[PDB]
């Protein structure tokens, strides 16, 4: 004598994270800024070094 309610099916998908890759280790390698302007400010002048 039990009134059966209609079941509720979940129509929602799981959400993603802020880490854009799998690990936090693999993701850390892909945050190093690469370019030709980064080598520019490191080697700046040899005569200033000399």
């Amino acid at each position: 004598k039990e009134k059966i309610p209609p079941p509720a099916f979940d129509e929602t998908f799981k959400k993603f994270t802020f880490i854009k890759m799998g690990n936090k280790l693999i993701n850390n390698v892909w945050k190093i800024p690469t370019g030709l302007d980064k080598i520019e400010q490191e080697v700046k002048k040899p005569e200033g070094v000399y």
Binding site: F16, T17, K20, M21, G22, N23, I26
Partner: peptide
């Protein structure tokens, strides 16, 4: 990137 998310999870 979203193919490496599924592999690690």
């Amino acid at each position: 990137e979203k193919r490496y998310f599924i592999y690690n999870e």
